[PDB]
Amino acid sequence: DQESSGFAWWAGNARLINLSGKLLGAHVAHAGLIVFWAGAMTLFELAHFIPEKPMYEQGLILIPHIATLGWGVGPGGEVVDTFPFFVVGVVHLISSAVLGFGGVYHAIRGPETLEEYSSFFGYDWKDKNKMTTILGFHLIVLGIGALLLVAKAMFFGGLYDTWAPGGGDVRVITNPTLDPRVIFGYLLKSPFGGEGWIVSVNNLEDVVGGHIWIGLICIAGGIWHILTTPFGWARRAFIWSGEAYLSYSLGALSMMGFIATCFVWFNNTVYPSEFYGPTGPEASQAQAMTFLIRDQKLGANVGSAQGPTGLGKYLMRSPTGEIIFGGETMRFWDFRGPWLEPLRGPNGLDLNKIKNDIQPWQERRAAEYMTHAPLGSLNSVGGVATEINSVNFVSPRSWLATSHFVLAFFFLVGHLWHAGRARAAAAGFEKGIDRESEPVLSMPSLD
Amino acid sequence: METITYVFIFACIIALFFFAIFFREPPRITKK
Amino acid sequence: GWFDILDDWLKRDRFVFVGWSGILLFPCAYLALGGWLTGTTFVTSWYTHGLASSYLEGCNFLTVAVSTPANSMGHSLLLLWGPEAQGDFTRWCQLGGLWTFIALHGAFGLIGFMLRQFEIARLVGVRPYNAIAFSAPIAVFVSVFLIYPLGQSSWFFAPSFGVAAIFRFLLFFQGFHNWTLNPFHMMGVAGVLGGALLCAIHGATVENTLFQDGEGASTFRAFNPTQAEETYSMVTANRFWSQIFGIAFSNKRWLHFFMLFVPVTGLWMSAIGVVGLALNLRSYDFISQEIRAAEDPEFETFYTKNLLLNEGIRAWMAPQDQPHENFVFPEEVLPRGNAL
Amino acid sequence: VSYPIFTVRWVAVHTLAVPTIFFLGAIAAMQFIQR
Amino acid sequence: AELTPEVLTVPLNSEGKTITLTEKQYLEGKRLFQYACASCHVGGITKTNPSLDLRTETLALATPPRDNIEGLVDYMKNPTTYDGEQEIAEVHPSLRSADIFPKMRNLTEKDLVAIAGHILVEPKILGDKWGGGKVYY
Amino acid sequence: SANLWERFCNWVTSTDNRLYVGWFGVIMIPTLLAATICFVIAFIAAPPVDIDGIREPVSGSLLYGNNIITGAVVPSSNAIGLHFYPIWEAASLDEWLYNGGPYQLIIFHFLLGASCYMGRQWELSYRLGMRPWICVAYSAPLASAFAVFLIYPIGQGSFSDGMPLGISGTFNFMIVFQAEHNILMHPFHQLGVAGVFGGALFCAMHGSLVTSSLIRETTETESANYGYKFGQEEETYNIVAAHGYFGRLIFQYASFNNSRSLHFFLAAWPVVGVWFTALGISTMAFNLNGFNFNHSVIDAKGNVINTWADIINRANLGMEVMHERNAHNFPLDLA
Amino acid sequence: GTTGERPFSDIITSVRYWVIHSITIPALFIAGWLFVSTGLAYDVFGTPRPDSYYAQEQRSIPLVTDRFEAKQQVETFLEQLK
Numbered sequence A: 001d002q003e004s005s006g007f008a009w010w011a012g013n014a015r016l017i018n019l020s021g022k023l024l025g026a027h028v029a030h031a032g033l034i035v036f037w038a039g040a041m042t043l044f045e046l047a048h049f050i051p052e053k054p055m056y057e058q059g060l061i062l063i064p065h066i067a068t069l070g071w072g073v074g075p076g077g078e079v080v081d082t083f084p085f086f087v088v089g090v091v092h093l094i095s096s097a098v099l100g101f102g103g104v105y106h107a108i109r110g111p112e113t114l115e116e117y118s119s120f121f122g123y124d125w126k127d128k129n130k131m132t133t134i135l136g137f138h139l140i141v142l143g144i145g146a147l148l149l150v151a152k153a154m155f156f157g158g159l160y161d162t163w164a165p166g167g168g169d170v171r172v173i174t175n176p177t178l179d180p181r182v183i184f185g186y187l188l189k190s191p192f193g194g195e196g197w198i199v200s201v202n203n204l205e206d207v208v209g210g211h212i213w214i215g216l217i218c219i220a221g222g223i224w225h226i227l228t229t230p231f232g233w234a235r236r237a238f239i240w241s242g243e244a245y246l247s248y249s250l251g252a253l254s255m256m257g258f259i260a261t262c263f264v265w266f267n268n269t270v271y272p273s274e275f276y277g278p279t280g281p282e283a284s285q286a287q288a289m290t291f292l293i294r295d296q297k298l299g300a301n302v303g304s305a306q307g308p309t310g311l312g313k314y315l316m317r318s319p320t321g322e323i324i325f326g327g328e329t330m331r332f333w334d335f336r337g338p339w340l341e342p343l344r345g346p347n348g349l350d351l352n353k354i355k356n357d358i359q360p361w362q363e364r365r366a367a368e369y370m371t372h373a374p375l376g377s378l379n380s381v382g383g384v385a386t387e388i389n390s391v392n393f394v395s396p397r398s399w400l401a402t403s404h405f406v407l408a409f410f411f412l413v414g415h416l417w418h419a420g421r422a423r424a425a426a427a428g429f430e431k432g433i434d435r436e437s438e439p440v441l442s443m444p445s446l447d
Numbered sequence B: 001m002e003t004i005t006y007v008f009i010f011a012c013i014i015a016l017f018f019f020a021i022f023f024r025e026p027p028r029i030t031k032k
Numbered sequence C: 001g002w003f004d005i006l007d008d009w010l011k012r013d014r015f016v017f018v019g020w021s022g023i024l025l026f027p028c029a030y031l032a033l034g035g036w037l038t039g040t041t042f043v044t045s046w047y048t049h050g051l052a053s054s055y056l057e058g059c060n061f062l063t064v065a066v067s068t069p070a071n072s073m074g075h076s077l078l079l080l081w082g083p084e085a086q087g088d089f090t091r092w093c094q095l096g097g098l099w100t101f102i103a104l105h106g107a108f109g110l111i112g113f114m115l116r117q118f119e120i121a122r123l124v125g126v127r128p129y130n131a132i133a134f135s136a137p138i139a140v141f142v143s144v145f146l147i148y149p150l151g152q153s154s155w156f157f158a159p160s161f162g163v164a165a166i167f168r169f170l171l172f173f174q175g176f177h178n179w180t181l182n183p184f185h186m187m188g189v190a191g192v193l194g195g196a197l198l199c200a201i202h203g204a205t206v207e208n209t210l211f212q213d214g215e216g217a218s219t220f221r222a223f224n225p226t227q228a229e230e231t232y233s234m235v236t237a238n239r240f241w242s243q244i245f246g247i248a249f250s251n252k253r254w255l256h257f258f259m260l261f262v263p264v265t266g267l268w269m270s271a272i273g274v275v276g277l278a279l280n281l282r283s284y285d286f287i288s289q290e291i292r293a294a295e296d297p298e299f300e301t302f303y304t305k306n307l308l309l310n311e312g313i314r315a316w317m318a319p320q321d322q323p324h325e326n327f328v329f330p331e332e333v334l335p336r337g338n339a340l
Numbered sequence D: 001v002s003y004p005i006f007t008v009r010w011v012a013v014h015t016l017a018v019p020t021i022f023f024l025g026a027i028a029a030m031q032f033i034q035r
Numbered sequence E: 001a002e003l004t005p006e007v008l009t010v011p012l013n014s015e016g017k018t019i020t021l022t023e024k025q026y027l028e029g030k031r032l033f034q035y036a037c038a039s040c041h042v043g044g045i046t047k048t049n050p051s052l053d054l055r056t057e058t059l060a061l062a063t064p065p066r067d068n069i070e071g072l073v074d075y076m077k078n079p080t081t082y083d084g085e086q087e088i089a090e091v092h093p094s095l096r097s098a099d100i101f102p103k104m105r106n107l108t109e110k111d112l113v114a115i116a117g118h119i120l121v122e123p124k125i126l127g128d129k130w131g132g133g134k135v136y137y
Numbered sequence F: 001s002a003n004l005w006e007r008f009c010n011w012v013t014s015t016d017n018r019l020y021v022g023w024f025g026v027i028m029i030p031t032l033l034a035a036t037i038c039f040v041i042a043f044i045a046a047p048p049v050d051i052d053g054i055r056e057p058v059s060g061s062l063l064y065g066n067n068i069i070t071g072a073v074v075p076s077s078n079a080i081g082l083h084f085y086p087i088w089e090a091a092s093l094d095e096w097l098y099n100g101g102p103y104q105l106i107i108f109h110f111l112l113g114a115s116c117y118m119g120r121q122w123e124l125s126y127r128l129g130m131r132p133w134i135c136v137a138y139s140a141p142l143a144s145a146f147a148v149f150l151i152y153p154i155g156q157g158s159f160s161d162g163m164p165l166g167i168s169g170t171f172n173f174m175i176v177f178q179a180e181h182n183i184l185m186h187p188f189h190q191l192g193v194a195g196v197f198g199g200a201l202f203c204a205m206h207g208s209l210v211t212s213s214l215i216r217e218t219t220e221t222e223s224a225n226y227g228y229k230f231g232q233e234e235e236t237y238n239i240v241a242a243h244g245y246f247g248r249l250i251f252q253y254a255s256f257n258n259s260r261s262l263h264f265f266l267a268a269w270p271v272v273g274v275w276f277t278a279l280g281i282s283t284m285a286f287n288l289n290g291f292n293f294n295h296s297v298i299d300a301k302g303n304v305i306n307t308w309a310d311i312i313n314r315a316n317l318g319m320e321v322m323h324e325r326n327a328h329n330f331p332l333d334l335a
Numbered sequence G: 001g002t003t004g005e006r007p008f009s010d011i012i013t014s015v016r017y018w019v020i021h022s023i024t025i026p027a028l029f030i031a032g033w034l035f036v037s038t039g040l041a042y043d044v045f046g047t048p049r050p051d052s053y054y055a056q057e058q059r060s061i062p063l064v065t066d067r068f069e070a071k072q073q074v075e076t077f078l079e080q081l082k
């Protein structure tokens, strides 16, 4: 049916731009690979998982995702039951077979096109309505999902709240922030130091609350598109084609990819330092904690200690007056964390609490996190580039963040590429300048 | 004295830029 | 006459053209490549640099290398049958005979190859600008792997053949010669960096300024291997750049000559800079800067900063990097900032 | 056509082909040396 | 140039008596030392307090003496300050505090002996490297 | 008036402008004029900047003792970190020039405009009926400025760790980088140099092959260039003679005969390589550094047998141990 | 577009080819393998065995210090059971 007199081999999948049916097998077969992975990897992680040892010290990145939703863990991120892990893993792994079946089926047996084998499923790219509608269906499926989380947290068990009053623990959220003024406030937050935008979310109420809003707002738009067609501008503005639509979704993922990179790198809440590693700033903070703690025991008055530059070996002031840790760590004075907060006063680190309220669990927390900063090599040798071999470790936060910046990036190229193609395809010149009517040749010389 | 020399050459390169962009030889087709 | 028969045979059009040049090229080119591949996996650099340097010892593709000879050897050609090795092969290996082997052989191999271009050019009847161009890489190899160490104490300070073993050559040059601050190295990079730009930029300008000569999307097939019309709108390209950059080509003959010039000139300059580093005639400091830094302790530029980085590189490396000097730097003498 | 066997191309191909495999064999063996 | 049983002969107790480890214990210690120490004691130093190292001499002047299997072993069970005038099991991994330092839960007397042996054997092989820091890398 | 705004949009978008001020241009032209104008003044007259937040001003402008090679525009303070520092955030300019305010005003406007510059490289191609993608080639060098001016700082927690705007200031960025990340030992940088070396290489190959196989139409004492007229129908060189020579240098199937496949390769190589180099800096911005083979090969007793990888570590320690003399107060460099 | 040589494609497909190389290729492989595994390579290249970098006690390097009497000096380094 389709061969070189369609597209070139290495652009093969573009030969499916107009075979709805087969183009469905792909998406159903692909969606299989993701479940397969998710499932197959979880079991791989669990197969190697050692209960009495930090998750971040085991190259885990899925078990910690489950742990956050309050599963198999308890006080301080202590692993209680590995069953929920095994479950989530096998279930996915199975569903991968189910989906994979459909994919293979729709791509090599079933109808090569859909429009005729059922007009409901068959579709037309330029069919502004079918499009607005299918989009509408998916906008609801995703919306239900957003609530599927709100449920697990409020009814089915909770989530891992590291800020837990009694100290990190699985907690049931029964008071989601629904106040729009606050929820949407986040979107109006600067993305720079301090005000961190979305990534500044720091308590589960907002997380849960906000997801409540998204679920509804999302399904609402799902119905709205089901029941409509793009207006006028919406039409005189966009390009309506198979590629153009792709592109738009490409640029969309890219952006979400960058936002994700920063979330796992900066956020403490939805990414508990207990399962992942300590954050970049969190670790630099802990070094200051550790040594202010040490030397203070040797009889040093941290409050008045003067360092080489005359700035304050242990404590100094930020640009707006607050008391922070000194040293290069002055750049991370925006770090907040369960272990360190009880030392903060209304003006920042309180010299009295630091002087006699430091608790042992904090001293060892600071020590732990200090010696587990997110520094490591490709071959997984934890530490600074000049370090010695021995401690095989690279923070999950480093792995996640890099992988996703690469993907996020290439996708932005993907966007540019597929969008550039769509605009030339539409107007129609994505295959060359018309030897005959060469546009440039009809334009006045600027010379 | 040095500052002046550095800025001068710079100022000269920018002048060049101008003339190069706006005072090139109009690029003529076929009959050249 | 046999000569013309010998010729006849050589200049015969095979799969892999031999030619008179080949009589020099292939023997060498293969020996050079061979010696490397040999040492990389079998010979060590223990008796030479106190370093493991082959797969057989545990090195991976990055850490392996054919290390230079001892500093004792000096500039000795280190011939298999010379005063050093004395005909013995294994000793030769342990004294780094394999370095001058790869070096000197590959050297002739670059001569042979350029000659080849010259010979094949002549036969096929085309202009030799492919040979002129290749002078650039010769210069680099010649000045760096030969002229340089010829100015130093011995072959020991020439770049050792290997991946990592080359990175230290880089770090060394920063630390000891403050090479990055050299006008010639800069031109060098301006050319290589600028050359890799023309490359990319011209390529894209062509692929996105093409005429349609086919009905397919994959426009590759739509090309006439047999000349005729220009395959891309040279006229459109001109207008594009003339409006986005302000300047734009308009004489493919020049646009292409320019592409030969930029990177070949760059490498030539980077060579001269090194020919000067041989005598240690480096571009290390700016005297006016040093004088002000001496009298005034609060004057600080990104330059002074760098020089301190060099001091550290030299002090912390010199010991295991120049074994023949039996350096011993007490912990208290080692330059270091606070805490680190 | 009636193509020959031992040709110039063949020689070359082996000068690189033969040693290579001999090395890949050597190296493959090193993966087991220890201490 | 090898790890002879001659090198694996390290002091067992304070009264001169010695014990001889085996290439199995050694490797095993080395593995355990990585599992529960490297984190902070990589290469014989101490990241969260660079003033105290694992150099045998340092352990010799410790109080009580911690430069023999018996010593280090006690330490891994009930840790103290260099003068021994204060127990630190609360902020230093040890058996009496495995609830706080899980990595120490598995650890059995067999394991503690290996880790201890490693500490006395390493400097024997590496020498100055073991104690010092980056200066010796 | 057919309608002012209707007209405006026709001018902006006009393909008859000497310089195509596009839609993207409307953002570009201003941001780029600010970046450029602020830079030039800074570089010439700005006063010392406390780059490391330790009250130890680094003067990098001509009028304050620098020359073209040393001079630079210094990065915002470390006291500032990633915080936004617009002029209206300072009690005074004196305060703004001391904390390295100019740096941000410049990097932000530049990065902004240089992106639109890409957006424009698309637009004009559209208004002219030519295929897009050129702008995608320019995504590589841009994706680098981004990596070196923004990603790395975001990753490291401060703009003071972004690459300075000056010659020597850049060498500083490099030398230190190497020490903290051992970049030379990272796959992505290597791919980077392959692309750059390769590019220059290929740039020379093409350049010569073509120039050497030009059809004669010029005198013996006449510039061989005149043999070409702007707006020619047929080609100016024998791409069949070119391929004929190059195919014999190496061997036929290892040589291009399709000008389109030649030029795709010519563009693909450097752009792909630089893409990786940019991803390298953007990746080592989260501390996933190069291979660490320190003390890998050890002998039968346990002794450490050095490799060139170790000689590299010493050179790195020298850099580590000496950079930022007075900025560190603790053991580990986690920032 | 052609020269005398028999089009690789044909050869890499000829059952004769494999009938020959299924023997030849693994042949060469097993040879080199043995070259390493029999310790022969170590002697052909004077490369130290894991237990031959230093003498038991010594921690010094066998650095060759003078060209002409180098070979002689190297031999002595092997002496101290290095």
Ligand code: CLA
Binding pocket: A009, A010, A011, A012, A013, A014, A015, A246, A250, A410, A411, A412, A413, A414, A415, A417, A418, A421
């Ligand atoms: C959202 C996902 C997405 C989707 C659905 C598409 C879909 C499509 N793309 Mg786009 N693309 C994307 C993202 C996406 N792309 C991104 C992020 C980029 C930037 C790099 C591109 C760049 C791109 C280009 C440059 C081209 C397309 C083309 C096409 C069309 C044909 C497909 C094809 O050529 O397959 C054939 C696929 C291959 C030959 C596979 C190449 C393999 C990759 C490069 C290796 C990745 C490495 C891997 C991770 C390593 C594993 C190790 C290995 C040893 C096993 C198709 C409509 C083509 C077209 O004609 O345009 C309309 C085309 O030329 N795409």
Ligand code: CLA
Binding pocket: A037, A045, A058, A059, A060, A061, A378, A380, A396, A399, A400, A403, A404, F272
């Ligand atoms: C994309 C996200 C992602 C992330 C963040 C991780 C993260 C992690 N993985 Mg997982 N993994 C993934 C996807 C991912 N993985 C997939 C898709 C698979 C199936 C193949 C696996 C299979 C897998 C296994 C089997 C294992 C891990 C392990 C690990 C952990 C150790 C990392 C490591 O050792 O890397 C080392 C890896 C590299 C240095 C490879 C870099 C490769 C890059 C992407 C290639 C760049 C080339 C480019 C594409 C070339 C194209 C150019 C051309 C077109 C011109 C780490 C937590 C390990 C673990 O759990 O042990 C503790 C482990 O054993 N992973």
Ligand code: CLA
Binding pocket: A001, A002, A003, A008, A009, A010, A011, A012, A013, A014, A015, A016, A022, A023, A024, A025, A026, A027, A029, A030, A097, A098, A100, A101, A102, A104, A107, A108
């Ligand atoms: C994400 C993965 C992916 C997916 C889902 C598809 C999907 C598809 N491709 Mg694309 N393709 C891909 C990657 C992918 N491709 C890549 C990387 C390249 C570049 C090398 C191409 C190049 C390409 C070309 C050149 C062409 C396609 C075509 C097609 C379509 C027809 C399928 C076909 O020809 O079967 C042929 C059938 C077989 C020979 C059988 C293969 C075996 C099956 C599919 C796998 C069984 C899987 C598993 C082992 C069993 C599960 C069983 C269990 C559930 C019980 C189909 C929509 C064709 C098209 O345009 O459609 C008309 C076409 O011409 N593709």
Ligand code: CLA
Binding pocket: A024, A028, A098, A099, A100, A101, A102, A103, A105, A106, A110, A111, A114, A117, A118, A121, A122, A141, A144
């Ligand atoms: C991506 C989603 C997807 C989509 C859109 C389609 C679409 C289509 N399929 Mg395929 N299919 C899929 C996945 C999908 N399939 C998978 C994974 C498999 C493997 C099991 C198959 C196996 C398959 C077969 C064997 C056949 C089709 C056929 C068809 C076509 C006829 C319609 C039909 O079967 O109605 C079926 C009837 C319904 C409308 C009821 C479905 C309701 C189920 C029980 C619930 C699903 C629940 C869902 C998971 C949750 C959403 C709820 C949420 C909103 C709250 C249609 C084009 C037929 C065909 O080729 O004819 C042209 C056919 O014979 N499909």
Ligand code: CLA
Binding pocket: A132, A135, A139, A187, A188, A217, A218, A219, A220, A221, A222, A224, A225, A228, A229, A230, A231, A234, A237
């Ligand atoms: C993600 C899924 C999704 C998708 C793909 C679409 C897609 C579409 N929507 Mg729907 N919509 C959705 C979800 C979705 N919608 C939901 C959940 C709701 C309920 C709130 C709506 C409500 C909705 C309405 C009320 C309308 C649409 C319309 C449209 C169409 C044109 C939109 C447009 O021109 O935007 C481009 C818009 C602009 C010119 C404004 C650019 C300014 C943005 C908002 C700010 C700058 C962005 C910045 C980069 C982001 C940073 C974050 C910020 C908070 C600071 C398009 C088909 C329109 C239509 O035609 O209806 C049928 C329309 O009137 N949608």
Ligand code: CLA
Binding pocket: C023, C024, C027, C028, C031, C077, C078, C079, C080, C081, C097, C100, C101, C102, C104, C105, C108
């Ligand atoms: C034809 C190409 C060729 C060339 C140019 C070279 C060149 C070189 N080889 Mg290589 N070599 C080659 C092929 C080639 N080789 C091949 C195929 C092999 C594998 C067998 C080798 C194996 C090899 C080894 C094992 C060694 C070299 C070495 C060398 C270098 C110095 C050797 C020397 O002093 O020669 C002197 C030159 C001549 C013998 C030419 C004499 C020519 C005249 C016309 C003949 C007169 C002869 C007559 C008897 C004299 C009358 C005078 C009377 C007073 C006695 C030199 C760079 C050495 C090295 O690399 O050192 C570090 C080394 O050890 N080569």
Ligand SMILES: C=Cc1c(C)c2cc3nc(c4c5[nH]c(cc6nc(cc1[nH]2)C(C)=C6CC)c(C)c5C(=O)[C@@H]4C(=O)OC)[C@@H](CCC(=O)OC/C=C(\C)CCC[C@H](C)CCC[C@H](C)CCCC(C)C)[C@@H]3C
Binding pocket: C028, C029, C030, C032, C033, C034, C036, C102, C105, C106, C107, C109, C110, C113, C117, C130, C133, C134, C136, C137, C141, C161, C162, C163, C166, C192, C263, C264, C267, F197, F198, F200, F201, F202, F204, F205, F208, F249
């Ligand atoms: C480091 C990067 C770099 C490499 C690896 C490289 C490589 C090559 N360039 C060639 C050509 C060219 N390069 C050119 C311009 C440039 N080339 C550049 C940069 C490079 N060029 C730059 C920057 C330019 C612009 C000035 C031109 C104009 C040409 C050509 O015409 C030619 C070609 O054919 O194009 C494809 C090929 C010549 C082959 C040959 O002579 O075989 C025969 C000789 C042999 C095999 C002897 C090798 C001997 C050397 C001296 C010893 C090396 C030692 C070991 C074998 C190598 C391992 C060591 C490393 C790990 C460090 C070769 C593939």
Ligand SMILES: CC1=C(/C=C/C(C)=C/C=C/C(C)=C/C=C/C=C(C)/C=C/C=C(C)/C=C/C2=C(C)CCCC2(C)C)C(C)(C)CCC1
Binding pocket: A025, A026, A029, A030, A032, A033, A036, A090, A093, A094, A096, A097, A098, A099, A100, A101, A103, A104, A107
């Ligand atoms: C179309 C196409 C394609 C694609 C494909 C795809 C995409 C596929 C998929 C597929 C899939 C997606 C599949 C899946 C499957 C699955 C399965 C088959 C599963 C199973 C499972 C199980 C069995 C489980 C269980 C268990 C447990 C629970 C535990 C223990 C162990 C075990 C494992 C046993 C290609 C490219 C080739 C080509 C062209 C065409």
Ligand SMILES: CCCCCCCCCCCCO[C@@H]1O[C@H](CO)[C@@H](O[C@H]2O[C@H](CO)[C@@H](O)[C@H](O)[C@H]2O)[C@H](O)[C@H]1O
Binding pocket: B001, B003, B004, B007, B008, B011, F063
């Ligand atoms: C291309 C456009 C060119 C026109 C633009 C205007 C450029 C003007 C640049 C300033 C040139 C003068 O720059 C200035 O020169 C004088 C010497 O003459 C230097 O010397 C100055 O400091 C020294 C002490 O260090 C004093 O003893 C001296 O009296 C004082 O003039 C200044 O430190 C330098 O800043």
Ligand SMILES: [Cl-]
Binding pocket: C305, F172, F176, F322, F323, F324, F325
């Ligand atoms: Cl510095």
